[PDB]
Design a protein around this ligand. Structure first.
Ligand SMILES: [O]C(=O)[C][C]OC1=[C][C]=C(C2345B678B9%10%11B6%12%13B96%14B%109%15B%1172B932B437B%1285B%1363C%14%1527C2=[C][C]=C(C([O])(C(F)(F)F)C(F)(F)F)[C]=[C]2)[C]=[C]1
Lengths: 10, 238
């Protein structure tokens, strides 16, 4: 759903 | 009255802002070039996309933010992103000629540039008024970074699951801000400063709502959505 957001949040 | 814990919070946020705001604007060279049709949409979409990444970097360092679930971190950033970007942009805004001056003539944006990205006076007029009113507050950087953190962790954002935890994190930041103003902001500039800062958060909510409307109208057209970035489409919608 939000892969780019998730990856930046990692 | 400013406890050891509260000075630590300010120090972290000051560091988080310094690590995620480049006052040289060097990276702007990587964007698609500004053209002065929505001729400024590619460049300003790249700018917003770049700003979202910076906002995420800052949010990750807010004390307590990482204790939220991934879902709650995502909804807070999705909802607050455009507000924090508008907040952060005040550092580049100048009342000399009511523009966002990011280091050079090419990277100096006025109301015409924002209109050439697809937005209208319904957003741009209250936006300029917000930038002017925020500038007139002459916030300490301590107050500026606290306001950004409080903006992000708002428990009334749509989609928040753990509103009680979000409120707890925000309350610690708000108490830090209130105590900082009381102990460190001299009068007369301190007069009702906390209330005025929270009013600016209310202003940002309304700006957020109007930006959403214009973005939805703009992005509804595939010719425009083609010019956005993948990150912008994920955060603001397709
Ligand atoms: O280092 C740093 O982080 C500092 C980064 O400096 C910055 C960051 C952001 C701004 C801006 B300022 B207010 B004016 B509006 B808003 B802020 B953001 B740009 B300029 B324009 C902005 C803006 C552009 C594009 C849209 C879009 O709606 C459009 F492109 F129009 F579709 C988008 F989709 F959101 F992109 C919405 C809002 C100036 C300096």
């Amino acid at each position: 759903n939000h892969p780019m957001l998730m990856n930046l949040l990692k | 009255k400013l406890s050891e814990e509260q000075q630590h919070i300010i120090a972290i946020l000051l560091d988080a802002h310094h690590k995620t705001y480049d006052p040289t604007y060097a990276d702007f060279r990587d964007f698609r070039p500004p053209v002065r049709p929505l001729s400024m949409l590619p460049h300003l979409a790249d700018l917003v996309s770049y700003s979202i990444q910076k906002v995420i970097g800052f949010a990750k360092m807010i004390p307590g933010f990482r204790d939220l679930t991934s879902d709650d971190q995502i909804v807070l950033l999705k909802s607050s992103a455009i507000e924090v970007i508008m907040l952060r942009s005040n550092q580049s805004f100048t009342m000399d000629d009511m523009s966002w001056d990011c280091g050079s003539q090419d990277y100096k944006y006025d109301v015409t540039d924002v209109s050439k990205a697809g937005h209208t006076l319904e957003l741009i007029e209250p936006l300029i008024k917000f930038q002017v009113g925020l500038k007139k507050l002459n916030l300490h950087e301590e107050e500026h970074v606290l306001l950004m953190a409080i903006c992000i962790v708002s428990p009334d954002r749509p989609g928040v699951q753990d509103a009680k935890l979000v409120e707890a994190i925000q309350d610690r930041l708000s108490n830090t801000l209130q105590t900082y103003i009381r102990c460190r902001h001299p009068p007369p500039g301190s007069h009702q400063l906390y209330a005025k800062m929270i009013q600016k958060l209310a202003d940002l909510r309304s700006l957020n709502e109007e930006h959403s409307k214009q973005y939805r109208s703009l992005s509804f057209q595939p010719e425009n959505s083609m010019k956005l970035t993948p990150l912008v489409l994920e955060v603001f919608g397709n």
